[PDB]
Amino acid sequence: AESILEYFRPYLGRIEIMGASRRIERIYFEISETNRAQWEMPQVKESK
């Protein structure tokens, strides 16, 4: 399943939180296409 993974690699998010069990957990979620586009703008990136 390497070919399917590579197409969805830029879109698969991943974070880490800790709560409700006093232990660390992983989270997975979908990143929308447009939100990946307008995030990488010269104005927005410089403000960061």
Binding site: G13, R14, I15, E16, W39
Partner: protein, 48 residues
Amino acid sequence: ELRDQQEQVKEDMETKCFICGIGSDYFDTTPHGFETHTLEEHNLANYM
């Protein structure tokens, strides 16, 4: 004085995760370790 501040922001982000409290010394036992920890794991961009 101003030049000293410019390097200080550079150094602090280099050896700390800005989310974790862990220095780069601990995240280097695994080869090429600290670099992945700031991109694959929590990277203060996925959270947004």
